[PDB]
Amino acid sequence: QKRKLQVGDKLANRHGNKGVVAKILPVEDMPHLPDGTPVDVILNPLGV
């Protein structure tokens, strides 16, 4: 089977920050740069 990312999957970086995916948003809902480029991931600053 071919598995795509879904709500409940676990992600991490190399510095020990981990968490499960809780929400998937359509592209027009994401924050974007003034040139129209949207971001991919939103991380909480309260974990730092």
- What are the residues binding other proteins (CB under 8 A)? 3-14, 18, 20, 26-39, 41
Nearer to other proteins, 3 or 47 (CB): 3
What is the smallest separation between the CB atom of 48 and other proteins, expressed in angstroms?
10
Which residue, 8, 35, 37, 1, is CA-closest to 23? 8
User: Cα dist. 31→2, 5, 12, 14, 26 in Å?
Assistant: 29, 20, 22, 25, 11
What is the smallest separation between the CB atom of 12 and other proteins, expressed in angstroms?
6
What is the smallest separation between the CB atom of 46 and other proteins, expressed in angstroms?
14
